[PDB]
mmCIF file of C-alpha atoms and ligand atoms in Angstrom:
data_model
loop_
_atom_site.group_PDB
_atom_site.id
_atom_site.type_symbol
_atom_site.label_atom_id
_atom_site.label_comp_id
_atom_site.label_asym_id
_atom_site.label_seq_id
_atom_site.Cartn_x
_atom_site.Cartn_y
_atom_site.Cartn_z
ATOM 1 C CA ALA A 1 -10.365 -6.339 -19.942
ATOM 2 C CA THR A 2 -8.094 -7.761 -22.650
ATOM 3 C CA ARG A 3 -5.238 -5.314 -22.003
ATOM 4 C CA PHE A 4 -3.223 -7.899 -20.037
ATOM 5 C CA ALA A 5 -2.752 -10.161 -23.076
ATOM 6 C CA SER A 6 0.699 -11.168 -21.829
ATOM 7 C CA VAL A 7 2.498 -12.399 -18.704
ATOM 8 C CA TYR A 8 5.036 -9.613 -18.042
ATOM 9 C CA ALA A 9 2.623 -6.773 -17.221
ATOM 10 C CA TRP A 10 0.861 -8.163 -14.117
ATOM 11 C CA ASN A 11 -1.119 -4.884 -14.061
ATOM 12 C CA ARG A 12 0.658 -3.785 -10.846
ATOM 13 C CA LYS A 13 -2.654 -2.726 -9.272
ATOM 14 C CA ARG A 14 -3.934 -2.287 -5.718
ATOM 15 C CA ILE A 15 -7.455 -1.942 -4.302
ATOM 16 C CA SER A 16 -8.305 0.672 -1.672
ATOM 17 C CA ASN A 17 -11.852 -0.430 -0.777
ATOM 18 C CA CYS A 18 -13.858 -3.379 -2.129
ATOM 19 C CA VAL A 19 -17.344 -3.636 -0.612
ATOM 20 C CA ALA A 20 -19.065 -5.473 -3.476
ATOM 21 C CA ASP A 21 -21.241 -8.303 -2.179
ATOM 22 C CA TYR A 22 -20.892 -11.709 -3.815
ATOM 23 C CA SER A 23 -24.655 -12.098 -4.302
ATOM 24 C CA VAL A 24 -24.745 -8.926 -6.431
ATOM 25 C CA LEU A 25 -23.550 -11.017 -9.393
ATOM 26 C CA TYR A 26 -27.108 -12.380 -9.708
ATOM 27 C CA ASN A 27 -28.523 -8.945 -10.664
ATOM 28 C CA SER A 28 -28.706 -9.801 -14.374
ATOM 29 C CA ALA A 29 -24.894 -9.822 -14.565
ATOM 30 C CA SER A 30 -22.953 -12.208 -16.812
ATOM 31 C CA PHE A 31 -19.791 -12.479 -14.694
ATOM 32 C CA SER A 32 -18.373 -15.910 -13.920
ATOM 33 C CA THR A 33 -18.588 -17.034 -10.305
ATOM 34 C CA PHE A 34 -15.424 -16.396 -8.313
ATOM 35 C CA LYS A 35 -13.238 -19.416 -7.534
ATOM 36 C CA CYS A 36 -10.829 -19.168 -4.600
ATOM 37 C CA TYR A 37 -7.905 -21.386 -3.600
ATOM 38 C CA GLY A 38 -7.103 -21.832 0.080
ATOM 39 C CA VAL A 39 -10.417 -20.290 1.189
ATOM 40 C CA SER A 40 -14.067 -20.829 0.353
ATOM 41 C CA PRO A 41 -15.398 -18.458 -2.337
ATOM 42 C CA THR A 42 -17.818 -16.696 0.023
ATOM 43 C CA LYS A 43 -14.959 -15.634 2.331
ATOM 44 C CA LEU A 44 -14.572 -12.516 0.175
ATOM 45 C CA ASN A 45 -18.019 -11.404 1.366
ATOM 46 C CA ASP A 46 -17.478 -12.687 4.932
ATOM 47 C CA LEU A 47 -14.032 -11.693 6.237
ATOM 48 C CA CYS A 48 -11.253 -9.212 5.477
ATOM 49 C CA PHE A 49 -7.846 -9.709 3.870
ATOM 50 C CA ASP B 1 -4.304 -19.394 -28.490
ATOM 51 C CA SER B 2 -4.467 -22.718 -30.353
ATOM 52 C CA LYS B 3 -3.821 -20.903 -33.650
ATOM 53 C CA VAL B 4 -0.281 -20.029 -34.681
ATOM 54 C CA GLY B 5 1.044 -16.481 -34.443
ATOM 55 C CA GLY B 6 0.068 -15.955 -30.799
ATOM 56 C CA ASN B 7 3.569 -16.564 -29.435
ATOM 57 C CA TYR B 8 4.004 -12.818 -28.850
ATOM 58 C CA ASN B 9 1.871 -13.090 -25.702
ATOM 59 C CA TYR B 10 4.495 -15.299 -24.038
ATOM 60 C CA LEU B 11 7.022 -13.405 -21.915
ATOM 61 C CA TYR B 12 8.650 -14.818 -18.777
ATOM 62 C CA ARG B 13 10.158 -12.929 -15.849
ATOM 63 C CA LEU B 14 11.046 -13.167 -12.169
ATOM 64 C CA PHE B 15 9.373 -11.666 -9.124
ATOM 65 C CA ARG B 16 9.759 -7.944 -8.419
ATOM 66 C CA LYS B 17 10.934 -8.319 -4.811
ATOM 67 C CA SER B 18 12.364 -5.163 -3.262
ATOM 68 C CA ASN B 19 13.733 -3.832 0.018
ATOM 69 C CA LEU B 20 15.538 -5.963 2.600
ATOM 70 C CA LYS B 21 12.245 -7.364 3.899
ATOM 71 C CA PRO B 22 11.356 -10.458 1.818
ATOM 72 C CA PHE B 23 8.162 -10.530 -0.242
ATOM 73 C CA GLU B 24 7.752 -6.807 -0.892
ATOM 74 C CA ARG B 25 6.669 -5.280 -4.188
ATOM 75 C CA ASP B 26 8.895 -2.955 -6.200
ATOM 76 C CA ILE B 27 9.235 0.151 -4.023
ATOM 77 C CA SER B 28 12.628 1.679 -4.927
ATOM 78 C CA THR B 29 12.666 1.301 -8.739
ATOM 79 C CA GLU B 30 15.027 -1.667 -8.833
ATOM 80 C CA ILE B 31 16.665 -3.189 -11.922
ATOM 81 C CA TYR B 32 14.864 -6.105 -13.577
ATOM 82 C CA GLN B 33 15.599 -8.298 -16.596
ATOM 83 C CA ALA B 34 13.495 -10.341 -19.019
ATOM 84 C CA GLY B 35 13.786 -13.469 -21.137
ATOM 85 C CA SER B 36 14.274 -17.011 -19.928
ATOM 86 C CA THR B 37 14.873 -17.326 -16.183
ATOM 87 C CA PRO B 38 15.510 -20.322 -13.911
ATOM 88 C CA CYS B 39 12.519 -22.553 -13.205
ATOM 89 C CA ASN B 40 11.636 -26.163 -12.382
ATOM 90 C CA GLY B 41 9.809 -28.627 -14.596
ATOM 91 C CA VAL B 42 10.035 -31.464 -17.095
ATOM 92 C CA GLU B 43 11.887 -31.292 -20.430
ATOM 93 C CA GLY B 44 8.860 -29.966 -22.281
ATOM 94 C CA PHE B 45 6.725 -26.820 -22.449
ATOM 95 C CA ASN B 46 8.511 -24.806 -19.756
ATOM 96 C CA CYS B 47 10.274 -21.499 -19.164
ATOM 97 C CA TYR B 48 13.636 -22.678 -20.530
ATOM 98 C CA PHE B 49 12.031 -23.840 -23.820
ATOM 99 C CA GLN C 1 -2.446 -49.772 -15.248
ATOM 100 C CA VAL C 2 -4.530 -49.480 -12.086
ATOM 101 C CA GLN C 3 -7.846 -47.631 -12.254
ATOM 102 C CA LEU C 4 -9.797 -45.701 -9.644
ATOM 103 C CA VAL C 5 -12.890 -47.414 -8.223
ATOM 104 C CA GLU C 6 -16.101 -45.404 -7.844
ATOM 105 C CA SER C 7 -19.627 -46.372 -6.855
ATOM 106 C CA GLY C 8 -21.802 -47.305 -9.819
ATOM 107 C CA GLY C 9 -20.463 -48.436 -13.178
ATOM 108 C CA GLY C 10 -21.955 -50.636 -15.851
ATOM 109 C CA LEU C 11 -25.075 -49.853 -17.831
ATOM 110 C CA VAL C 12 -27.212 -47.060 -16.357
ATOM 111 C CA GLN C 13 -30.852 -46.551 -17.300
ATOM 112 C CA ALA C 14 -31.512 -43.254 -19.055
ATOM 113 C CA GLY C 15 -33.281 -40.642 -16.955
ATOM 114 C CA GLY C 16 -32.542 -42.467 -13.699
ATOM 115 C CA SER C 17 -30.580 -41.539 -10.595
ATOM 116 C CA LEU C 18 -27.219 -42.790 -9.357
ATOM 117 C CA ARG C 19 -24.650 -42.030 -6.666
ATOM 118 C CA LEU C 20 -20.951 -41.336 -7.264
ATOM 119 C CA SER C 21 -18.647 -41.980 -4.298
ATOM 120 C CA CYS C 22 -14.921 -42.664 -4.226
ATOM 121 C CA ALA C 23 -13.727 -46.049 -2.969
ATOM 122 C CA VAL C 24 -9.939 -45.668 -2.774
ATOM 123 C CA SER C 25 -8.363 -44.310 0.407
ATOM 124 C CA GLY C 26 -4.707 -43.815 -0.547
ATOM 125 C CA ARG C 27 -5.377 -40.341 -1.995
ATOM 126 C CA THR C 28 -8.736 -39.133 -0.703
ATOM 127 C CA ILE C 29 -10.455 -36.133 -2.265
ATOM 128 C CA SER C 30 -10.571 -34.373 1.115
ATOM 129 C CA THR C 31 -6.797 -33.872 1.047
ATOM 130 C CA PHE C 32 -7.040 -32.145 -2.349
ATOM 131 C CA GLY C 33 -10.521 -30.735 -1.681
ATOM 132 C CA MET C 34 -13.852 -32.456 -2.257
ATOM 133 C CA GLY C 35 -14.925 -32.453 -5.891
ATOM 134 C CA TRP C 36 -15.735 -34.559 -8.917
ATOM 135 C CA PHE C 37 -14.730 -34.589 -12.574
ATOM 136 C CA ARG C 38 -15.308 -36.891 -15.540
ATOM 137 C CA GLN C 39 -13.310 -37.707 -18.674
ATOM 138 C CA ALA C 40 -15.379 -37.872 -21.849
ATOM 139 C CA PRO C 41 -14.443 -40.460 -24.496
ATOM 140 C CA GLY C 42 -11.065 -39.647 -26.003
ATOM 141 C CA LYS C 43 -8.827 -37.219 -24.099
ATOM 142 C CA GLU C 44 -11.357 -34.596 -22.975
ATOM 143 C CA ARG C 45 -11.627 -33.461 -19.349
ATOM 144 C CA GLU C 46 -14.577 -31.654 -17.784
ATOM 145 C CA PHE C 47 -15.923 -30.646 -14.377
ATOM 146 C CA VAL C 48 -19.367 -31.520 -13.016
ATOM 147 C CA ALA C 49 -19.910 -29.933 -9.591
ATOM 148 C CA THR C 50 -18.660 -29.641 -6.019
ATOM 149 C CA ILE C 51 -19.936 -28.757 -2.544
ATOM 150 C CA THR C 52 -18.694 -25.755 -0.562
ATOM 151 C CA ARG C 53 -18.473 -25.536 3.225
ATOM 152 C CA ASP C 54 -21.078 -22.748 3.249
ATOM 153 C CA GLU C 55 -23.780 -25.158 1.968
ATOM 154 C CA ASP C 56 -25.837 -22.165 0.759
ATOM 155 C CA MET C 57 -24.494 -22.125 -2.820
ATOM 156 C CA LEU C 58 -23.016 -25.034 -4.780
ATOM 157 C CA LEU C 59 -20.490 -24.519 -7.578
ATOM 158 C CA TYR C 60 -22.399 -25.679 -10.665
ATOM 159 C CA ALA C 61 -20.805 -26.512 -14.013
ATOM 160 C CA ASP C 62 -22.352 -24.811 -17.033
ATOM 161 C CA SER C 63 -22.508 -28.170 -18.826
ATOM 162 C CA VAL C 64 -24.638 -29.724 -16.062
ATOM 163 C CA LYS C 65 -25.716 -26.540 -14.283
ATOM 164 C CA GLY C 66 -28.865 -27.125 -12.249
ATOM 165 C CA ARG C 67 -28.883 -30.876 -12.987
ATOM 166 C CA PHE C 68 -26.628 -32.607 -10.450
ATOM 167 C CA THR C 69 -27.204 -32.358 -6.702
ATOM 168 C CA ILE C 70 -24.984 -33.092 -3.702
ATOM 169 C CA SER C 71 -26.130 -34.307 -0.287
ATOM 170 C CA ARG C 72 -24.554 -33.097 2.953
ATOM 171 C CA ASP C 73 -24.298 -34.581 6.439
ATOM 172 C CA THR C 74 -22.853 -33.220 9.668
ATOM 173 C CA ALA C 75 -21.093 -36.370 10.917
ATOM 174 C CA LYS C 76 -20.834 -38.594 7.823
ATOM 175 C CA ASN C 77 -17.520 -36.914 6.901
ATOM 176 C CA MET C 78 -18.129 -37.867 3.262
ATOM 177 C CA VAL C 79 -19.521 -36.279 0.099
ATOM 178 C CA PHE C 80 -21.912 -38.123 -2.227
ATOM 179 C CA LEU C 81 -22.714 -36.857 -5.726
ATOM 180 C CA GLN C 82 -26.215 -37.574 -7.050
ATOM 181 C CA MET C 83 -27.101 -37.359 -10.740
ATOM 182 C CA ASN C 84 -30.527 -36.385 -12.059
ATOM 183 C CA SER C 85 -31.978 -36.704 -15.571
ATOM 184 C CA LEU C 86 -29.151 -38.780 -17.008
ATOM 185 C CA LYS C 87 -28.640 -38.705 -20.777
ATOM 186 C CA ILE C 88 -26.789 -40.812 -23.332
ATOM 187 C CA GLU C 89 -24.105 -38.117 -23.589
ATOM 188 C CA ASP C 90 -23.320 -38.636 -19.884
ATOM 189 C CA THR C 91 -21.380 -41.799 -20.801
ATOM 190 C CA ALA C 92 -17.865 -41.027 -19.559
ATOM 191 C CA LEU C 93 -15.278 -42.216 -17.060
ATOM 192 C CA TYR C 94 -15.722 -40.787 -13.557
ATOM 193 C CA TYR C 95 -12.651 -39.844 -11.515
ATOM 194 C CA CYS C 96 -12.030 -38.874 -7.902
ATOM 195 C CA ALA C 97 -10.714 -35.361 -7.297
ATOM 196 C CA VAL C 98 -6.912 -35.668 -7.288
ATOM 197 C CA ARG C 99 -4.162 -33.218 -8.241
ATOM 198 C CA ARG C 100 -0.757 -34.141 -9.647
ATOM 199 C CA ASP C 101 0.763 -31.488 -7.349
ATOM 200 C CA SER C 102 0.111 -30.404 -3.778
ATOM 201 C CA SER C 103 -2.686 -27.839 -3.518
ATOM 202 C CA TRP C 104 -5.895 -27.101 -1.629
ATOM 203 C CA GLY C 105 -8.891 -25.001 -2.590
ATOM 204 C CA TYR C 106 -12.206 -24.808 -4.407
ATOM 205 C CA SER C 107 -12.517 -24.152 -8.136
ATOM 206 C CA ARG C 108 -14.817 -24.667 -11.122
ATOM 207 C CA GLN C 109 -12.373 -25.275 -13.980
ATOM 208 C CA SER C 110 -12.213 -28.309 -16.252
ATOM 209 C CA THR C 111 -8.449 -28.774 -15.790
ATOM 210 C CA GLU C 112 -8.700 -28.586 -11.987
ATOM 211 C CA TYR C 113 -7.934 -32.299 -11.551
ATOM 212 C CA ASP C 114 -6.210 -34.932 -13.673
ATOM 213 C CA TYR C 115 -4.492 -38.259 -13.071
ATOM 214 C CA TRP C 116 -3.008 -41.073 -15.129
ATOM 215 C CA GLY C 117 -5.050 -43.822 -13.486
ATOM 216 C CA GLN C 118 -8.327 -44.443 -15.275
ATOM 217 C CA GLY C 119 -11.664 -44.016 -13.527
ATOM 218 C CA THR C 120 -14.796 -46.117 -13.266
ATOM 219 C CA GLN C 121 -16.382 -46.799 -16.656
ATOM 220 C CA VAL C 122 -20.023 -45.663 -16.746
ATOM 221 C CA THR C 123 -22.198 -46.313 -19.805
ATOM 222 C CA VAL C 124 -25.574 -44.594 -20.234
ATOM 223 C CA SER C 125 -27.964 -45.482 -23.053
ATOM 224 C CA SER C 126 -31.687 -45.600 -23.767
ATOM 225 C CA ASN D 1 -4.664 30.343 -2.323
ATOM 226 C CA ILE D 2 -0.927 29.883 -2.906
ATOM 227 C CA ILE D 3 0.053 26.648 -1.136
ATOM 228 C CA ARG D 4 -1.426 24.015 -3.452
ATOM 229 C CA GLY D 5 -0.291 20.859 -1.656
ATOM 230 C CA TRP D 6 2.369 19.015 0.294
ATOM 231 C CA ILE D 7 5.029 16.367 -0.334
ATOM 232 C CA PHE D 8 5.750 13.434 1.987
ATOM 233 C CA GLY D 9 8.514 10.863 1.737
ATOM 234 C CA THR D 10 11.866 9.632 3.004
ATOM 235 C CA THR D 11 14.358 10.089 0.142
ATOM 236 C CA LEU D 12 12.206 12.504 -1.918
ATOM 237 C CA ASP D 13 13.265 10.790 -5.158
ATOM 238 C CA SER D 14 12.479 7.752 -7.309
ATOM 239 C CA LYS D 15 14.215 5.432 -4.805
ATOM 240 C CA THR D 16 11.126 5.163 -2.572
ATOM 241 C CA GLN D 17 7.380 5.652 -2.891
ATOM 242 C CA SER D 18 6.356 9.137 -1.757
ATOM 243 C CA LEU D 19 2.868 10.480 -1.115
ATOM 244 C CA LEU D 20 2.005 13.505 -3.256
ATOM 245 C CA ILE D 21 -0.860 15.877 -2.440
ATOM 246 C CA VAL D 22 -1.693 18.728 -4.829
ATOM 247 C CA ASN D 23 -4.652 21.037 -5.409
ATOM 248 C CA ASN D 24 -6.080 22.751 -8.478
ATOM 249 C CA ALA D 25 -9.209 24.584 -9.635
ATOM 250 C CA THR D 26 -11.118 21.370 -10.480
ATOM 251 C CA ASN D 27 -10.424 18.705 -7.834
ATOM 252 C CA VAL D 28 -7.957 17.757 -5.100
ATOM 253 C CA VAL D 29 -5.499 15.266 -6.577
ATOM 254 C CA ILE D 30 -3.744 12.738 -4.329
ATOM 255 C CA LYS D 31 -1.379 10.162 -5.821
ATOM 256 C CA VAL D 32 1.386 7.836 -4.625
ATOM 257 C CA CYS D 33 4.323 7.410 -7.007
ATOM 258 C CA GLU D 34 8.123 7.256 -6.991
ATOM 259 C CA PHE D 35 8.236 10.927 -7.921
ATOM 260 C CA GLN D 36 11.644 12.476 -8.608
ATOM 261 C CA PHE D 37 10.896 15.585 -6.581
ATOM 262 C CA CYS D 38 12.758 18.688 -7.697
ATOM 263 C CA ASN D 39 14.885 20.666 -5.259
ATOM 264 C CA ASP D 40 12.397 23.574 -5.466
ATOM 265 C CA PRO D 41 8.977 22.101 -6.295
ATOM 266 C CA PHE D 42 6.136 24.433 -7.255
ATOM 267 C CA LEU D 43 3.272 24.893 -9.720
ATOM 268 C CA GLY D 44 3.782 27.072 -12.782
ATOM 269 C CA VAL D 45 0.862 29.503 -13.065
ATOM 270 C CA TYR D 46 0.770 32.379 -15.555
ATOM 271 C CA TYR D 47 -1.848 34.863 -16.708
ATOM 272 C CA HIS D 48 -3.853 33.743 -19.725
ATOM 273 C CA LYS D 49 -3.082 35.419 -23.040
ATOM 274 C CA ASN D 50 -6.699 36.518 -23.598
ATOM 275 C CA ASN D 51 -8.862 35.228 -20.734
ATOM 276 C CA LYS D 52 -6.737 37.335 -18.318
ATOM 277 C CA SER D 53 -7.138 34.615 -15.650
ATOM 278 C CA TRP D 54 -4.464 32.516 -13.981
ATOM 279 C CA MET D 55 -3.513 29.463 -16.039
ATOM 280 C CA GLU D 56 -1.202 26.567 -15.239
ATOM 281 C CA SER D 57 1.845 26.117 -17.476
ATOM 282 C CA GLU D 58 4.223 23.562 -15.917
ATOM 283 C CA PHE D 59 3.898 21.202 -12.949
ATOM 284 C CA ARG D 60 7.421 21.733 -11.656
ATOM 285 C CA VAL D 61 7.095 19.326 -8.715
ATOM 286 C CA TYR D 62 8.820 16.265 -10.180
ATOM 287 C CA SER D 63 10.471 14.983 -13.352
ATOM 288 C CA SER D 64 9.485 11.299 -13.512
ATOM 289 C CA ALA D 65 7.566 8.640 -11.589
ATOM 290 C CA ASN D 66 8.413 5.281 -13.207
ATOM 291 C CA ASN D 67 5.817 3.602 -10.977
ATOM 292 C CA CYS D 68 2.176 3.962 -9.934
ATOM 293 C CA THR D 69 0.653 2.668 -6.694
ATOM 294 C CA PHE D 70 -2.422 4.757 -5.798
ATOM 295 C CA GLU D 71 -4.643 7.603 -6.984
ATOM 296 C CA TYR D 72 -7.540 9.413 -5.326
ATOM 297 C CA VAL D 73 -9.706 12.467 -6.006
ATOM 298 C CA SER D 74 -11.791 14.702 -3.760
ATOM 299 C CA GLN D 75 -13.907 17.820 -4.022
ATOM 300 C CA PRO D 76 -11.993 21.132 -3.845
ATOM 301 C CA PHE D 77 -11.761 22.986 -0.550
ATOM 302 C CA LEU D 78 -12.483 26.714 -0.263
ATOM 303 C CA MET D 79 -11.441 28.557 -3.434
ATOM 304 C CA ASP D 80 -9.765 31.962 -3.594
ATOM 305 C CA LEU D 81 -8.225 32.522 -7.024
ATOM 306 C CA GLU D 82 -7.829 36.295 -7.437
ATOM 307 C CA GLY D 83 -6.421 38.298 -4.541
ATOM 308 C CA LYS D 84 -8.973 40.628 -2.969
ATOM 309 C CA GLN D 85 -9.569 42.527 0.267
ATOM 310 C CA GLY D 86 -6.827 43.433 2.739
ATOM 311 C CA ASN D 87 -7.451 40.511 5.089
ATOM 312 C CA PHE D 88 -6.226 36.913 5.329
ATOM 313 C CA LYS D 89 -9.664 35.525 6.200
ATOM 314 C CA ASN D 90 -8.994 32.360 4.155
ATOM 315 C CA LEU D 91 -7.441 30.403 7.018
ATOM 316 C CA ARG D 92 -6.815 26.681 6.506
ATOM 317 C CA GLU D 93 -5.421 24.250 9.083
ATOM 318 C CA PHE D 94 -4.184 20.719 8.432
ATOM 319 C CA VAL D 95 -2.786 17.912 10.594
ATOM 320 C CA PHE D 96 -0.825 14.948 9.226
ATOM 321 C CA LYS D 97 0.278 11.731 10.916
ATOM 322 C CA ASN D 98 1.436 8.266 9.846
HETATM 323 C C1 LIG E 1 -9.821 13.808 -14.404
HETATM 324 C C2 LIG E 1 -8.662 14.675 -14.795
HETATM 325 O O1 LIG E 1 -8.678 15.365 -15.810
HETATM 326 N N1 LIG E 1 -7.609 14.653 -13.971
HETATM 327 C C3 LIG E 1 -6.404 15.433 -14.200
HETATM 328 C C4 LIG E 1 -5.192 14.739 -13.586
HETATM 329 O O2 LIG E 1 -5.002 13.475 -14.213
HETATM 330 C C5 LIG E 1 -3.946 15.597 -13.758
HETATM 331 O O3 LIG E 1 -2.853 15.012 -13.059
HETATM 332 C C6 LIG E 1 -4.194 17.002 -13.217
HETATM 333 C C7 LIG E 1 -3.040 17.945 -13.469
HETATM 334 O O4 LIG E 1 -3.210 19.172 -12.772
HETATM 335 O O5 LIG E 1 -5.344 17.575 -13.856
HETATM 336 C C8 LIG E 1 -6.548 16.842 -13.633
#
């Protein structure tokens, strides 16, 4: 999404349930691999936040 | 971004803290400003320039 | 100015294999997170690869995706980067992962690390 | 059906986020916004000019939100649009806790 082509919006968004596995990105998808600071990238698929 | 005319995307602000409890998102429709705000950095490409 | 010391250097045979390990101990990569990056001739910065604690998937750089490999050991407490199928274009200074500001994490961006001190000079030619 | 939803909050205005639950003929709409709840909230329903069926005109439940935090949808519960029979068989019970 190119809507947030600025710095003031911030999109003010919240997620209710995110149960998308990390390995699903290999199903012919062209999405860049997630990079996480302070925690290993796979922690999204392992633990809760 | 490297090309001129993209300066419109730049817009600085402060955090939207709310409520007495620190580190809480806008919950009571507070009053917020825009433009240059205090920040820390070198005398170069920064918030105050 | 002082320059970072890394294993290797000098002329490297094309298509060979070499190891890249940091030698300095004042600012180890572990403090800022294990990783490696190289500066191409001029003022261009790029990322090569890094090893994640999971050990099941390694963050690969699109430029060298599927080329470089990293070995892992339980008690060595060190990370060694191994290069495969070297090319003439690989000629570039190699730097140890260091950040100008305090931070910790894993990432796959070219501008992840940068420092004033120069790195080991590695020349690759046929 | 006459009661089309409920309102939950502390100040019942734009000074605090308030849960809003409403119902319609398509889906159950649940949203969380700083709604400026009116003193007498309700849903404006009037007979259609030609269709002769009930039609919504104004959503007199709030005036402004000024903030969005959550939105959810769900399938409608039991429908009873036009009054019929002399019994209140359409009994619905709800329990809410926080
Ligand atoms: C999918 C869709 O059309 N949803 C709308 C909803 O946005 C609106 O608030 C409501 C008003 O009754 O009608 C319905």
